[PDB]
PDB file of C-alpha atoms in Angstrom:
ATOM      1  CA  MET A   1     160.603 104.891  89.464  1.00 45.13           C
ATOM      2  CA  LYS A   2     160.965 103.856  93.127  1.00 43.30           C
ATOM      3  CA  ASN A   3     160.331 100.217  92.143  1.00 44.03           C
ATOM      4  CA  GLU A   4     163.735 100.199  90.400  1.00 40.06           C
ATOM      5  CA  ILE A   5     165.449 101.532  93.546  1.00 38.48           C
ATOM      6  CA  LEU A   6     163.853  98.996  95.921  1.00 39.03           C
ATOM      7  CA  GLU A   7     164.244  96.066  93.505  1.00 38.95           C
ATOM      8  CA  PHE A   8     167.874  97.119  92.951  1.00 40.08           C
ATOM      9  CA  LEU A   9     168.661  97.094  96.694  1.00 41.73           C
ATOM     10  CA  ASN A  10     167.195  93.564  96.795  1.00 44.56           C
ATOM     11  CA  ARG A  11     169.804  92.037  94.452  1.00 45.60           C
ATOM     12  CA  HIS A  12     172.592  93.955  96.232  1.00 45.93           C
ATOM     13  CA  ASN A  13     172.756  95.700  99.633  1.00 48.12           C
ATOM     14  CA  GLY A  14     174.884  98.633 100.853  1.00 49.66           C
ATOM     15  CA  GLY A  15     175.585 101.658  98.622  1.00 48.35           C
ATOM     16  CA  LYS A  16     175.725 105.454  99.046  1.00 44.69           C
ATOM     17  CA  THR A  17     172.799 107.468  97.641  1.00 42.44           C
ATOM     18  CA  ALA A  18     174.670 108.866  94.611  1.00 41.78           C
ATOM     19  CA  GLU A  19     176.095 105.361  94.368  1.00 37.75           C
ATOM     20  CA  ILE A  20     172.637 103.807  94.371  1.00 43.27           C
ATOM     21  CA  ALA A  21     171.724 106.268  91.606  1.00 41.38           C
ATOM     22  CA  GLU A  22     174.692 105.086  89.515  1.00 40.62           C
ATOM     23  CA  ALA A  23     173.349 101.525  89.803  1.00 39.68           C
ATOM     24  CA  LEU A  24     169.986 102.587  88.332  1.00 38.47           C
ATOM     25  CA  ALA A  25     171.477 105.455  86.288  1.00 33.07           C
ATOM     26  CA  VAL A  26     168.072 107.112  86.760  1.00 31.88           C
ATOM     27  CA  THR A  27     167.606 110.575  88.294  1.00 31.76           C
ATOM     28  CA  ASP A  28     170.146 110.333  91.153  1.00 31.51           C
ATOM     29  CA  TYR A  29     168.511 113.494  92.548  1.00 29.96           C
ATOM     30  CA  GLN A  30     165.059 111.862  92.415  1.00 28.67           C
ATOM     31  CA  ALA A  31     166.528 108.500  93.411  1.00 27.03           C
ATOM     32  CA  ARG A  32     167.886 109.883  96.702  1.00 24.86           C
ATOM     33  CA  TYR A  33     164.629 111.771  97.389  1.00 24.34           C
ATOM     34  CA  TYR A  34     162.900 108.400  97.042  1.00 22.38           C
ATOM     35  CA  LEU A  35     164.947 106.497  99.646  1.00 21.86           C
ATOM     36  CA  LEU A  36     163.997 109.281 102.088  1.00 23.17           C
ATOM     37  CA  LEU A  37     160.243 109.186 101.377  1.00 24.52           C
ATOM     38  CA  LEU A  38     160.272 105.364 101.491  1.00 25.60           C
ATOM     39  CA  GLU A  39     162.379 105.349 104.681  1.00 24.50           C
ATOM     40  CA  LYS A  40     159.511 107.259 106.333  1.00 23.11           C
ATOM     41  CA  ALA A  41     157.180 104.313 105.627  1.00 19.71           C
ATOM     42  CA  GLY A  42     159.663 101.792 107.077  1.00 17.58           C
ATOM     43  CA  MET A  43     160.179  99.911 103.787  1.00 19.25           C
ATOM     44  CA  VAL A  44     163.817 101.058 103.514  1.00 17.08           C
ATOM     45  CA  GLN A  45     166.647 102.075 105.876  1.00 12.89           C
ATOM     46  CA  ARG A  46     169.667 104.416 105.763  1.00 11.29           C
ATOM     47  CA  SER A  47     173.024 104.695 107.570  1.00  6.97           C
ATOM     48  CA  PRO A  48     174.660 107.883 108.867  1.00  5.25           C
ATOM     49  CA  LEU A  49     177.799 107.123 106.816  1.00  6.06           C
ATOM     50  CA  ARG A  50     180.306 108.766 109.184  1.00  4.93           C
ATOM     51  CA  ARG A  51     183.144 107.744 106.835  1.00  5.50           C
ATOM     52  CA  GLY A  52     182.578 109.158 103.328  1.00  5.30           C
ATOM     53  CA  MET A  53     180.112 111.794 102.066  1.00  4.79           C
ATOM     54  CA  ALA A  54     176.671 110.442 101.077  1.00  6.54           C
ATOM     55  CA  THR A  55     175.144 108.300 103.871  1.00  5.48           C
ATOM     56  CA  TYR A  56     173.886 104.865 102.750  1.00  5.09           C
ATOM     57  CA  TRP A  57     170.514 103.453 101.736  1.00  7.58           C
ATOM     58  CA  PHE A  58     169.409  99.811 101.368  1.00  8.56           C
ATOM     59  CA  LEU A  59     166.230  97.701 101.660  1.00  9.78           C
ATOM     60  CA  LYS A  60     165.018  97.169 105.248  1.00 10.61           C
ATOM     61  CA  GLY A  61     167.678  94.484 105.829  1.00  9.68           C
ATOM     62  CA  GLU A  62     165.415  91.746 104.436  1.00  5.85           C
ATOM     63  CA  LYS A  63     162.445  89.929 106.017  1.00  5.53           C
ATOM     64  CA  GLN A  64     161.469  87.586 108.878  1.00  7.79           C
ATOM     65  CA  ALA A  65     163.600  89.914 111.038  1.00  7.10           C
ATOM     66  CA  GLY A  66     160.641  90.772 113.302  1.00  6.17           C
ATOM     67  CA  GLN A  67     157.458  88.849 112.413  1.00  5.82           C
ATOM     68  CA  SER A  68     159.322  85.556 111.860  1.00  4.82           C
ATOM     69  CA  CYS A  69     156.277  83.255 112.073  1.00  9.72           C
ATOM     70  CA  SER A  70     154.943  85.809 114.588  1.00 10.47           C
ATOM     71  CA  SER A  71     157.047  83.953 117.190  1.00 12.58           C
ATOM     72  CA  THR A  72     153.849  82.228 118.384  1.00 13.34           C
ATOM     73  CA  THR A  73     155.518  78.847 119.022  1.00 13.16           C
ATOM     74  CA  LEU A  74     158.023  79.584 121.816  1.00 16.87           C
ATOM     75  CA  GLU A  75     155.729  79.730 124.874  1.00 18.40           C
ATOM     76  CA  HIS A  76     154.380  76.149 124.948  1.00 18.59           C
ATOM     77  CA  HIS A  77     150.824  75.865 123.568  1.00 15.71           C
ATOM     78  CA  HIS A  78     148.963  76.360 126.871  1.00 17.34           C
ATOM     79  CA  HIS A  79     150.995  74.817 129.722  1.00 18.87           C
ATOM     80  CA  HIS A  80     149.953  71.214 130.477  1.00 18.75           C
ATOM     81  CA  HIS A  81     147.766  71.216 127.332  1.00 18.67           C
TER      82      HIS A  81
END
């Protein structure tokens, strides 16, 4: 169930793959394979954990981190207007 993995990362944030599996206690093997498939869509992200042994996977940071209101109110509505 990928929904449990994404919803889980929402409440928390930052956990190795086998660690994320422990949180859901689901199929750690299938859990990790999910973060990868989802990461390809851009709904989740992962970190090259260079200090441990299981990388890291967590929701795509959060939201409003790119389309914040579409940033369509920072160029003056038509100069002079």
